[PDB]
């Protein structure tokens, strides 16, 4: 029971007729999911995909995708979720980094792959039975399932994050990494058989690890939120009621859209029992309203980078009428130890600002195809400990950005912008907080001043996911730098002066 795939087998043995996973089309019992998993195991063997090899899941969530994950885990095959809305060029960079031997995708996006740098990688079609590449058309007659020795700290899956160079970085995560978090969550929130989990986050963000693996760990049901329903906040909240959702896990921005336009505070979703949020500062004005409407719900702020999953958690009590600052991120989670570090390396005193440092079982194996992580992980998140021992998040000093929960390296965006023939230099910064945050590009043009914001967005759309494309651009003749090239961050003053000038009229 030290391996992820063993957890759902244990639940299958206890609860075969109970609903395991739900999407728009199908709803699979644990037995039906088992049969589905066995088909994908047979498929992977028939394709000669062996222990240690990587496969890309480049498709929208479905019960089949969940089965693929269990199947790959059973064979020691490392699965790599890729944003289905991500451009081919970024899929290219990920295929190269992981050296995947197989792409699972829709038939629609095969056409784009024919002209790609992964035209030679084998691909199988998940959706369209009319494709020669349809996964079911692969003949499994001579397939034979091997017996493997898989250790709990063997690599299970890779979640790619934004990379400062433009090449995404792959967080390589072991069975032990996932199960430390899964077991911690299950003990802390007492997830029970037959509860219904909502999977809002896409599979390539680690929030789905709780939604899917905690559900399969306790004999509960995971309900996959389709993008068509994720986009009407009124339909998201109706989704909760129709599926009798009891556990919810999302970034605060999702909860705020459901409050603003989904009737979440007036049409009370009374099946909710545990309401977890993570990834970004939940504006305290709005958390106050949410806590008042759901006063008896387990409600919690979860913290950490993908490199550690949740390393710190805080149970939300009341929200003081006078509170202005976000609720604390709390104390150590997932079996880890946590402290704030001075630059000298020593432990901060209470009240001192320091960098969060994490040591324990959810700390990643390391970046894929890069040297292993040794010792405690420095997160880059600045923190301060309160007299009561809880930590408060302060922000970062480096170039990692957040826009509505999405992790964005300044260098990934800058690299796409600088590649434009007319862009000479480029700096990216976020202006505004919360739902008003906007991604700005501060550029230096080679010629004239004629740069179309739309031409810049199409150019970015070929390289970046949509949430990484700049909202607004600011053209000036020089970027301000310190004596050793660091961008002066006084561009924020320049941007604020631009926005204020427009309000004046």
């Amino acid at each position: 029971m030290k391996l992820l795939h063993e957890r759902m087998m244990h639940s299958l043995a206890r609860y075969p007729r109970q609903t395991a996973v739900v999407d728009e089309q199908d709803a699979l019992s644990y037995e039906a999911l088992e049969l589905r998993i066995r088909e994908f195991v047979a498929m992977l063997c028939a394709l000669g995909v062996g222990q240690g090899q990587r496969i890309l899941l480049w498709a929208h969530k479905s019960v089949d995708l969940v089965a693929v994950m269990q199947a790959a885990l059973r064979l020691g095959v490392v699965y790599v979720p890729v944003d289905p809305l991500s451009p081919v060029s970024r899929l290219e960079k990920i295929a190269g980094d992981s050296q995947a031997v197989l792409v699972l995708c829709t038939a629609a996006r095969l056409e784009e792959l024919a002209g790609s740098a992964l035209a030679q990688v084998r691909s199988v079609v998940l959706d369209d039975p009319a494709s020669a590449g349809y996964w079911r058309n692969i003949d499994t007659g001579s397939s034979v399932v091997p017996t493997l020795a898989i250790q709990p700290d063997d690599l299970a899956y890779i979640l790619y994050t934004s990379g400062s160079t433009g090449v995404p970085k792959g967080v390589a995560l072991s069975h032990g990494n996932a199960l430390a978090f899964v077991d911690w969550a299950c003990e802390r929130y007492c997830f029970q058989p037959g509860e219904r989990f909502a999977n809002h986050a896409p599979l390539h963000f680690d929030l789905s690890v709780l939604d899917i693996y905690c559900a399969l760990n306790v004999g509960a049901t995971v309900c996959l939120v389709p993008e068509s329903i994720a986009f009407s906040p009124r339909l998201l909240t109706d989704f909760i009621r129709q599926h009798e959702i009891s556990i919810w896990y999302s970034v605060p921005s999702v909860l705020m859209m459901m409050m603003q336009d989904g009737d979440l505070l007036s049409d009370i979703q009374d099946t909710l029992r545990v309401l977890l949020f993570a990834g970004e500062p939940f504006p305290v004005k709005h958390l106050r309203d949410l806590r008042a409407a759901y006063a008896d719900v387990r409600l919690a702020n979860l913290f950490g980078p993908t490199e550690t999953n949740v390393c710190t958690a805080f149970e939300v009590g009341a929200i003081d009428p006078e509170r202005v600052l976000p609720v604390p991120i709390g104390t150590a989670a997932s079996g880890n130890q946590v402290w704030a570090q001075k630059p000298d390396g020593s432990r901060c005193a209470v009240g001192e600002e320091g960098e969060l440092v994490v040591q324990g079982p959810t700390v990643m194996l390391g970046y894929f195809a890069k040297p292993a992580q040794e010792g405690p992980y420095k997160t880059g998140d600045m923190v301060r400990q309160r007299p009561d021992g809880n930590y408060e998040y302060l922000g970062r000093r480096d170039d990692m950005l957040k826009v509505r929960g999405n992790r964005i390296e300044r260098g990934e965006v800058e690299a796409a912008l600088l590649a434009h023939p007319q862009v000479s230099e480029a700096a990216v910064l976020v202006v505004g907080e919360g739902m008003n945050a906007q991604l700005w590009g501060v550029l230096v043009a080679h010629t004239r001043d004629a740069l179309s914001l739309i031409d810049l967005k199409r150019h970015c759309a070929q390289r970046l996911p949509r949430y990484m494309i700049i909202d607004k651009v600011l053209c000036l003749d020089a970027l301000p730098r310190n004596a050793n090239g660091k961008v002066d961050r006084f561009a924020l003053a320049r941007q604020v002066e631009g926005k204020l000038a427009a309000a004046l009229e």
Binding site: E227, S228, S253, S452, I454, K457, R458, I469
Partner: protein, 79 residues
């Protein structure tokens, strides 16, 4: 003429008044012209300019992908 009021509105609200490359068929979400959080700022303009109330079942991404999608919606919601 719905297309004219939306092409115009979108440039000032989301392109800082630059109508250079925008038309009825440009994909608004793929180009991060319209984000997650500005979806209702658009629905609010369609309720005042077109004078028809938008439903929850029709806050589908296909209806708001493009200006040609939003105009078709108002024609659809009118008859």
């Amino acid at each position: 003429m719905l297309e004219s009021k939306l092409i115009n509105h979108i440039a000032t609200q989301f392109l800082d008044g630059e109508k250079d490359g925008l038309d009825s068929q440009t994909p608004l979400f793929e180009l991060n012209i319209v984000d997650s959080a500005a979806i209702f700022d658009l629905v609010d303009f369609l309720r005042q300019e077109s004078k028809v109330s938008i439903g929850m079942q029709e806050i589908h991404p296909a209806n708001f992908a493009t200006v040609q999608s939003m105009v078709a919606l108002v024609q659809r919601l009118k008859a």
